[PDB]
Amino acid sequence: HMVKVQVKQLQGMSLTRKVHPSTTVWELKGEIEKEWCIPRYQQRLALQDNSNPALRDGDSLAAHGLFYDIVLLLLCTEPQEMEVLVKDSNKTTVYTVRPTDTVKQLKQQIYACQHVPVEQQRLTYETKELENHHTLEHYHVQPRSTIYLLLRLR
């Protein structure tokens, strides 16, 4: 019911995990993180043997057509920034942030651009509400993912 996923590094060092085909690429990067401590944001995954597409963090292996044993090559990249979509009642705005930035720093960006005071902002990621002191990587916010904005005036 589960497939074999091997993740090989440039020099051949690798890890093997029995994972369910409904597991997302982002969640798979979290499994790579608990073994080798590489942040998910600095992990680039690609198929070793590819009938040919690029892996998408939000979708599962089976959503890529990968529901069998596969071999993935791992590349480590330098710490850069990512974008995050902030969807409010009517529109969706994009912000440039670092994975190490806290929720409060992102709220101040939303307040500078959408003109909504910080204390009024209630941000939720994957149904879970964010606290202003935690970082975005603490919530495993994927690059280019969506954060939902609701306004609380009291």
Side-chain angles (χ1 to χ4, degrees):
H1 217 63
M2 313 195 75
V3 301
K4 176 178 165 190
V5 169
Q6 193 193 355
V7 174
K8 304 197 311 180
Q9 179 250 15
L10 283 301
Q11 294 94 303
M13 185 178 48
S14 82
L15 52 85
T16 308
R17 302 272 172 274
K18 302 161 54 181
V19 83
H20 191 251
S22 68
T23 304
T24 62
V25 180
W26 190 246
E27 287 163 6
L28 182 64
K29 292 182 178 186
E31 281 285 340
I32 305 175
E33 183 177 37
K34 301 180 298 178
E35 181 59 39
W36 287 338
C37 307
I38 321 164
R40 306 185 196 193
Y41 306 92
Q42 300 187 227
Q43 289 178 37
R44 258 212 284 265
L45 291 174
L47 229 166
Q48 183 181 242
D49 308 324
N50 196 23
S51 173
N52 294 274
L55 295 174
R56 301 159 273 110
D57 297 327
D59 299 322
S60 67
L61 296 176
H64 296 86
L66 309 170
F67 42 102
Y68 48 91
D69 301 336
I70 60 178
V71 179
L72 299 167
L73 306 180
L74 171 61
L75 305 169
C76 302
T77 67
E78 301 207 25
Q80 55 186 351
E81 296 171 333
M82 71 191 187
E83 311 182 314
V84 285
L85 299 184
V86 179
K87 183 179 273 70
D88 58 53
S89 307
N90 46 291
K91 67 194 170 311
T92 302
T93 62
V94 61
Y95 293 93
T96 298
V97 301
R98 299 259 176 193
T100 63
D101 299 352
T102 78
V103 172
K104 181 171 178 192
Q105 313 193 220
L106 163 68
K107 293 203 186 170
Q108 301 172 321
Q109 283 206 260
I110 292 170
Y111 158 67
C113 305
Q114 295 180 228
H115 307 125
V116 40
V118 178
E119 64 266 353
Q120 287 186 19
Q121 298 182 34
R122 285 295 89 90
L123 294 182
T124 66
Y125 179 73
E126 295 176 338
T127 316
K128 325 313 297 176
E129 187 172 283
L130 315 182
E131 300 179 72
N132 300 265
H133 68 92
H134 281 306
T135 67
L136 298 178
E137 66 175 336
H138 177 263
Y139 298 117
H140 313 292
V141 168
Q142 321 179 12
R144 220 83 65 82
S145 60
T146 296
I147 296 172
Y148 289 96
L149 169 60
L150 287 158
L151 296 207
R152 264 57 185 154
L153 295 243
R154 278 160 60 168

